Amino acid sequence: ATPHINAEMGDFADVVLMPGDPLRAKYIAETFLEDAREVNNVRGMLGFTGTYKGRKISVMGHGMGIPSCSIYTKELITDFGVKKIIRVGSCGAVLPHVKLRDVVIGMGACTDSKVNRIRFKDHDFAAIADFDMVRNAVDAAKALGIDARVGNLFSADLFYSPDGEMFDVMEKYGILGVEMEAAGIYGVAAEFGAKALTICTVSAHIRTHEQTTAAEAQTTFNDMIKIALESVLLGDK
Amino acid sequence: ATPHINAEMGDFADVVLMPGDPLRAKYIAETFLEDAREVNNVRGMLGFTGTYKGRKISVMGHGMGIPSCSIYTKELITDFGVKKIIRVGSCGAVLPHVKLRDVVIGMGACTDSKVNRIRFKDHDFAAIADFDMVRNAVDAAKALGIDARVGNLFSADLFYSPDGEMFDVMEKYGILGVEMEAAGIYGVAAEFGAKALTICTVSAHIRTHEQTTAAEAQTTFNDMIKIALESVLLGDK
Amino acid sequence: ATPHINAEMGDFADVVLMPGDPLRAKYIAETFLEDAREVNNVRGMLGFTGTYKGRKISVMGHGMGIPSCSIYTKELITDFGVKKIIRVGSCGAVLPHVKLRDVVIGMGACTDSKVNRIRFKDHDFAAIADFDMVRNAVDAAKALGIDARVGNLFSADLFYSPDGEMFDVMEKYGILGVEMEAAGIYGVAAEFGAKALTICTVSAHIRTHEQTTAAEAQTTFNDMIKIALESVLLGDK
Amino acid sequence: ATPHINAEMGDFADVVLMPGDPLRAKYIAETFLEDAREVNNVRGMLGFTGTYKGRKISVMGHGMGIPSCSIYTKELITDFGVKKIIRVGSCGAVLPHVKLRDVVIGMGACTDSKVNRIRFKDHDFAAIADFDMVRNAVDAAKALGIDARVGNLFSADLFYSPDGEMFDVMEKYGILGVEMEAAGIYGVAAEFGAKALTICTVSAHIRTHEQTTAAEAQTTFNDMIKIALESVLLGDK
Amino acid sequence: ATPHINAEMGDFADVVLMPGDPLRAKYIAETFLEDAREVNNVRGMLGFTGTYKGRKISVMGHGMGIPSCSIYTKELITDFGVKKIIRVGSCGAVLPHVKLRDVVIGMGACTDSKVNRIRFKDHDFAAIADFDMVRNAVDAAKALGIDARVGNLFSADLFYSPDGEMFDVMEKYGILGVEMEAAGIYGVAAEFGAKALTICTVSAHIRTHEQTTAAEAQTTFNDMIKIALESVLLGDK
Amino acid sequence: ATPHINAEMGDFADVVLMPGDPLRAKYIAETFLEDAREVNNVRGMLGFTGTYKGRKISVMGHGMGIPSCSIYTKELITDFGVKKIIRVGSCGAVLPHVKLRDVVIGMGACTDSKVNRIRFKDHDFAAIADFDMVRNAVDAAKALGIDARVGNLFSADLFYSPDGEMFDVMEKYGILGVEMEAAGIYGVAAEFGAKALTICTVSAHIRTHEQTTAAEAQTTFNDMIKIALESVLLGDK
Ligand SMILES: Nc1ncnc2c([C@@H]3O[C@H](CO)[C@@H](O)[C@H]3O)n[nH]c12
Ligand SMILES: Nc1ncnc2c([C@@H]3O[C@H](CO)[C@@H](O)[C@H]3O)n[nH]c12
Ligand SMILES: Nc1ncnc2c([C@@H]3O[C@H](CO)[C@@H](O)[C@H]3O)n[nH]c12
Ligand SMILES: Nc1ncnc2c([C@@H]3O[C@H](CO)[C@@H](O)[C@H]3O)n[nH]c12
Ligand SMILES: Nc1ncnc2c([C@@H]3O[C@H](CO)[C@@H](O)[C@H]3O)n[nH]c12
Ligand SMILES: Nc1ncnc2c([C@@H]3O[C@H](CO)[C@@H](O)[C@H]3O)n[nH]c12
């Protein structure tokens, strides 16, 4: 057991899908995994392990924000033998050509957090996903006939940002989705020696104020899950 | 009625106690409140409203880290009429004279987060509690025969810090407890014109690695909750 | 003796009142202290030691700005056994409801100085007063029929700031008064393990230069000094 | 003509290979392009246009450092219709498993430059290559039977860095090569709306002090050129 | 009148000598100026105006630290028509070949203050003296048989710096003297379109507290004042 | 004998003039030196050594930007015994009274580069020229009947800045010319214990868009070179 996960080595697969919402983790386990078993509920942060097409897979929530997901991803990597983390999240769009439910793949993640500056002597660490995992997700999406854009996410510390003008800057620099975790997970993967990828579903448009409901995010973002799971199978080859 | 809280105005009291762990919110409601009812379960972040000695009180988890708790506190203040937030948590000590089970009140909170610099034009915002709430808590503790230390907390972005050296710095500058939320909550309170206070119990000593019993640790945790609840009654005057 | 104070251990009380204007020290000594003796004259920064209602008190100016007051407060603490510093001075207000002649107590002090970032590994140190000293001053003021406001000061490096927009930011975040010392004194207090408090009287509104008649200014100055001195007696407990 | 390029729209292909060394650009044109014509020599920064397997291609030096290459890439994008920039550079390795002449592909680029902070409101911009271009280079290398690692480069402002310890940090974070341009080119591509990729040949090992000669870098780094050119043909499909 | 100087336009010469120690102003006026009249006494910061060899000169102390001297120099320039400020003071040396009683002239001033970053959009402003004033002082010293060193001062915010390692960095980069004002005065001069120079006499080695006899210190002080005054006459040209 | 300079000790004079453009180095050697011979051609960065009025002098391009010129100047100083670097370049003016063809001497150089912060523990290093070289250049200009302005340059990382507002800031703080190298060269000189000076001719006015003739512009450029060469002869004394 670790301070935030009451489980033992072997309870998790070597690949873990991670939504921010533990209820989404529950939905994923019930809907996509066979013979799923709950392996953690410390702090209500539900985690499960089962199989997808014979392949051992885990899914567990990581909570909201870089500091929360940094705890869970670290513990999984250092104490549970986890080799790959695939965040399956939601995000808000700033670009005009992006619609609700669009799937975006974060090859990189910008951020206004200080965590990577703390790691990297106050320089610019380019928080990037593992290339093979990106390519696996792209290929899986194509086989599924699901459109997906690959590019930069922005990982915000403040969902309610006092700096509205920063969204103009994100838009200028082609940011595909604003979420709150990717850059931190990528920093953890590099620090602790594992691999990670974030895929998000657009659940809000920051300009139009169109948005999906909480229930929709919890139980209807199926495209990104299929992409994530099928991408794992590709990586195994 | 917000993306993270499925409740309506009136469902929350004008004061909310907030532990990090939603399971601990349920614990507090069951233990200390009469007629508590669940008012939120989005993302598993349980919230409850009941009464303490006839006074309407809410309790709801805030999740781990500044970004998580910043979402919930903002929404409570702007959308649910909440006037006071009291974070009730655990912290780690760095000072030799601060002991396991000491109760510490964060009149201020240092941080390595960038959120207040973003708010405050890259200058130093002193993230502080509301003075009247601090002295209500000090007085409630005194009435319960519990001494509480008042001073600075440090709100960390990284529970697993790569910078081992920062703990010596915290010790040098007299930090009473290390946690992950206070400076963010204080920043939200200032930004949105509300009042906040963080009280913590020392659950670990980053130095001594001291030991207590579960019974004693749980007693002190309950004492902290009683301090928080009684402090509200004093403020109501 | 120290580089800026020609005195020996014992020449200063364990509590020192510090105005910015060095001319105020002799005034305070003659008007409020009994049996005062001169204990410093280096650079014209006159210091005196006497008693107030039997209690040993010293008074000496600190000069304008963080670097000046940081020198005197450090030397007093490390070489003269001083345990408490009370800065007594003026501030300018940015809040429309904060009035000329209001007494404000800096529980915290924001700043645009780099001194605390230098101390605190470039993170956010919450520069705070000693809580008991704050409460003592609040209680002393109340007994004199004065309602003091407690909250954040802003300690500016530039009295003539080229950033006009910062005053609006200060206002938004509830800053009670703008002065030039508190954050520095609070930083020294934390660095060297002592206790400090800044009390200010509002002498100006930053944006509209209405002023106070000299007679009203002297009356309010005397009130502030009485609050400071009586607060010490309450602290002796 | 632009301030640093004496040519007109149409003189450059829509894809430009860019080594730092204009003499390497000359070598590339002579060795790999047919019917090459010199289209610029302002400041000795030689640029050429010819064909590779029937495909119009340009090659031009960009000079050393982010500020130098930022000028040339900008002008090409805004005034010469250039759509893709492929930097074909040299770099120094910090990882033990990396050898002289190894080819590395920079999907991302870390940096100690301030240029991206200036663009991105002092936040962390993840300076990333275009994904399709990365994938094209990976596929071309595989078809050529040439090994290539994909990951982060570090773009240094100081070839002679006074901070030797930063190399330990780069090594910890898996940096594949230290060069001086990638992060700046990626910033320009995003700012001015084009696509870019940096491929480098390891020409020095920062730990072992093994290094190739100036002449070798000028006229013998053929693997990376073949990869770059063949990757273009893949992208055209 | 201005907030810190009770005088009117014309009361000050267009050139003002400023010692840090306010007691030095009266000394300079009595010892070096003819027909001196008192022109300020606010906060005990005595100012005088007289003539030196027929030329109008004023002298007034500036207090310790950037924030203090920034107030006086700003008011003198904007409200009293002052064109040149010469700070005359002491510094501590870090270079082994810089000796006690050496005269040093700050052509530039490094700093750990944030004031110039606040002015200069967080970039590096090179805080510099007026070149002609520097050369005038060099020439005036030469005519008095004194060889002055010209180079960088370092203007510290903290006389008692917790960063001991910074003195070695200062030494490495050739800093001639450590004081507390020059960078601030130079910043004000640039902001308000005037000219400034800091001249210092070495009174200490930072690392080994050997000192100068009071008689030697007064002799060297007089030499510095004579250099300053004669430099003005050379500047009149 | 270095990766960027194929020459041996003795091939360079102890003073090197450096324009940005290697073709301009060749121009200077042909125009002003006797018996000039090429001593470097690596990366096309032409360098030459010849005599001026019997005095051995070298001239070599430094490329555009701080990172490029930092490589060449460091190597000249540490590997080729060079004692003095004189950058001879062009700059853009922001001040209305600074005119096309004015000669400006950079006694200091501001910058938006991070290189000096990296050197100087993240504080403000005032990047300055060698005082004696500045006054040699001023005197040489006077002897040629050319008035030269001495003050601050601004060394930009981005020739194409996204921050249009910085030019107003440069103007406000009195910057004489905008170029791309001086602060980097001055930082190198300080780091490695050598001496440097940047002289520029105003070739563009970022405001007026003034016009001159090519003949007149080229005359002034040659005057600047003569100032540089004659300044060396004065320093030799
Ligand atoms: N418009 C938006 N802005 C920032 N974060 C999110 C998210 C994700 O959902 C959570 C906040 O709702 C958090 O985990 C974040 O990554 N969905 N939509 C978002
Ligand atoms: N030694 C420590 N360091 C950082 N956070 C905590 C905590 C709290 O518990 C959570 C991390 O376990 C987080 O919400 C924080 O507030 N207890 N002890 C801590
Ligand atoms: N409106 C204002 N802005 C900045 N400082 C002050 C002060 C205090 O007075 C001094 C400036 O005159 C300085 O010591 C500061 O603490 N009073 N009113 C002020
Ligand atoms: N060990 C090293 N460190 C930094 N840059 C380089 C380079 C590249 O070559 C140039 C410096 O030699 C510059 O353009 C840079 O990108 N090769 N080897 C390098
Ligand atoms: N070794 C030293 N370190 C910092 N400042 C000074 C000074 C000057 O004297 C004052 C500090 O005593 C301050 O005004 C500064 O300019 N002399 N010697 C100094
Ligand atoms: N208005 C301007 N802005 C930036 N650099 C320059 C220059 C110089 O010329 C080069 C850029 O063209 C570079 O080396 C710089 O030093 N001339 N005019 C300039």
mmCIF file of N, CA and C in Angstrom, chain F residues 41-71:
data_model
loop_
_atom_site.group_PDB
_atom_site.id
_atom_site.type_symbol
_atom_site.label_atom_id
_atom_site.label_comp_id
_atom_site.label_asym_id
_atom_site.label_seq_id
_atom_site.Cartn_x
_atom_site.Cartn_y
_atom_site.Cartn_z
ATOM 1 N N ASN F 41 37.515 30.324 -41.485
ATOM 2 C CA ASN F 41 36.381 30.234 -42.397
ATOM 3 C C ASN F 41 35.365 29.154 -42.002
ATOM 4 N N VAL F 42 35.512 28.603 -40.800
ATOM 5 C CA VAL F 42 34.550 27.608 -40.318
ATOM 6 C C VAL F 42 33.148 28.210 -40.269
ATOM 7 N N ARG F 43 32.167 27.472 -40.790
ATOM 8 C CA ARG F 43 30.775 27.931 -40.850
ATOM 9 C C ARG F 43 30.638 29.242 -41.619
ATOM 10 N N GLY F 44 31.638 29.569 -42.436
ATOM 11 C CA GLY F 44 31.580 30.796 -43.218
ATOM 12 C C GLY F 44 31.799 32.050 -42.385
ATOM 13 N N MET F 45 32.185 31.874 -41.125
ATOM 14 C CA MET F 45 32.384 33.030 -40.250
ATOM 15 C C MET F 45 33.795 33.585 -40.416
ATOM 16 N N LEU F 46 33.995 34.300 -41.522
ATOM 17 C CA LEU F 46 35.319 34.793 -41.907
ATOM 18 C C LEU F 46 35.996 35.654 -40.850
ATOM 19 N N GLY F 47 37.271 35.364 -40.597
ATOM 20 C CA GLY F 47 38.076 36.168 -39.699
ATOM 21 C C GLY F 47 39.384 36.499 -40.382
ATOM 22 N N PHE F 48 39.938 37.667 -40.068
ATOM 23 C CA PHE F 48 41.158 38.142 -40.721
ATOM 24 C C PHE F 48 42.101 38.794 -39.726
ATOM 25 N N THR F 49 43.394 38.792 -40.044
ATOM 26 C CA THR F 49 44.380 39.511 -39.245
ATOM 27 C C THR F 49 45.293 40.284 -40.179
ATOM 28 N N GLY F 50 45.543 41.546 -39.843
ATOM 29 C CA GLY F 50 46.401 42.417 -40.634
ATOM 30 C C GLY F 50 46.913 43.513 -39.722
ATOM 31 N N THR F 51 47.340 44.641 -40.284
ATOM 32 C CA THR F 51 47.793 45.743 -39.442
ATOM 33 C C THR F 51 47.072 47.033 -39.764
ATOM 34 N N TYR F 52 46.896 47.861 -38.742
ATOM 35 C CA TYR F 52 46.396 49.216 -38.927
ATOM 36 C C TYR F 52 47.444 50.169 -38.374
ATOM 37 N N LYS F 53 48.026 50.984 -39.253
ATOM 38 C CA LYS F 53 49.123 51.877 -38.869
ATOM 39 C C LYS F 53 50.188 51.122 -38.066
ATOM 40 N N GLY F 54 50.508 49.917 -38.533
ATOM 41 C CA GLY F 54 51.570 49.120 -37.941
ATOM 42 C C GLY F 54 51.142 48.265 -36.765
ATOM 43 N N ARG F 55 49.904 48.456 -36.310
ATOM 44 C CA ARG F 55 49.392 47.747 -35.135
ATOM 45 C C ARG F 55 48.623 46.510 -35.569
ATOM 46 N N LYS F 56 48.986 45.352 -35.024
ATOM 47 C CA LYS F 56 48.312 44.102 -35.368
ATOM 48 C C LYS F 56 46.840 44.158 -34.922
ATOM 49 N N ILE F 57 45.922 43.847 -35.835
ATOM 50 C CA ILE F 57 44.481 43.928 -35.559
ATOM 51 C C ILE F 57 43.773 42.768 -36.241
ATOM 52 N N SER F 58 42.771 42.186 -35.582
ATOM 53 C CA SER F 58 41.962 41.157 -36.229
ATOM 54 C C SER F 58 40.529 41.644 -36.409
ATOM 55 N N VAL F 59 39.824 41.063 -37.371
ATOM 56 C CA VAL F 59 38.410 41.357 -37.544
ATOM 57 C C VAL F 59 37.705 40.084 -37.975
ATOM 58 N N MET F 60 36.567 39.793 -37.352
ATOM 59 C CA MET F 60 35.865 38.546 -37.627
ATOM 60 C C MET F 60 34.390 38.707 -37.294
ATOM 61 N N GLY F 61 33.515 38.149 -38.127
ATOM 62 C CA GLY F 61 32.085 38.242 -37.891
ATOM 63 C C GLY F 61 31.690 37.485 -36.636
ATOM 64 N N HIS F 62 30.592 37.889 -35.998
ATOM 65 C CA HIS F 62 30.143 37.163 -34.809
ATOM 66 C C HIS F 62 28.761 36.516 -34.981
ATOM 67 N N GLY F 63 28.141 36.699 -36.146
ATOM 68 C CA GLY F 63 26.802 36.168 -36.378
ATOM 69 C C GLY F 63 25.742 36.971 -35.629
ATOM 70 N N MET F 64 24.472 36.637 -35.836
ATOM 71 C CA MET F 64 23.410 37.429 -35.230
ATOM 72 C C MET F 64 22.932 36.818 -33.920
ATOM 73 N N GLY F 65 22.874 37.649 -32.889
ATOM 74 C CA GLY F 65 22.253 37.251 -31.642
ATOM 75 C C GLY F 65 23.245 36.892 -30.561
ATOM 76 N N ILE F 66 22.790 36.999 -29.321
ATOM 77 C CA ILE F 66 23.623 36.712 -28.158
ATOM 78 C C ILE F 66 24.258 35.311 -28.173
ATOM 79 N N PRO F 67 23.474 34.260 -28.486
ATOM 80 C CA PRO F 67 24.106 32.926 -28.473
ATOM 81 C C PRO F 67 25.243 32.765 -29.483
ATOM 82 N N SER F 68 25.100 33.357 -30.663
ATOM 83 C CA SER F 68 26.127 33.217 -31.686
ATOM 84 C C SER F 68 27.382 33.955 -31.246
ATOM 85 N N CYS F 69 27.242 35.245 -30.941
ATOM 86 C CA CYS F 69 28.419 36.034 -30.579
ATOM 87 C C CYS F 69 29.050 35.556 -29.271
ATOM 88 N N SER F 70 28.263 34.937 -28.391
ATOM 89 C CA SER F 70 28.824 34.399 -27.143
ATOM 90 C C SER F 70 29.809 33.255 -27.396
ATOM 91 N N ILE F 71 29.533 32.448 -28.411
ATOM 92 C CA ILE F 71 30.455 31.376 -28.789
ATOM 93 C C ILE F 71 31.794 31.949 -29.256
#
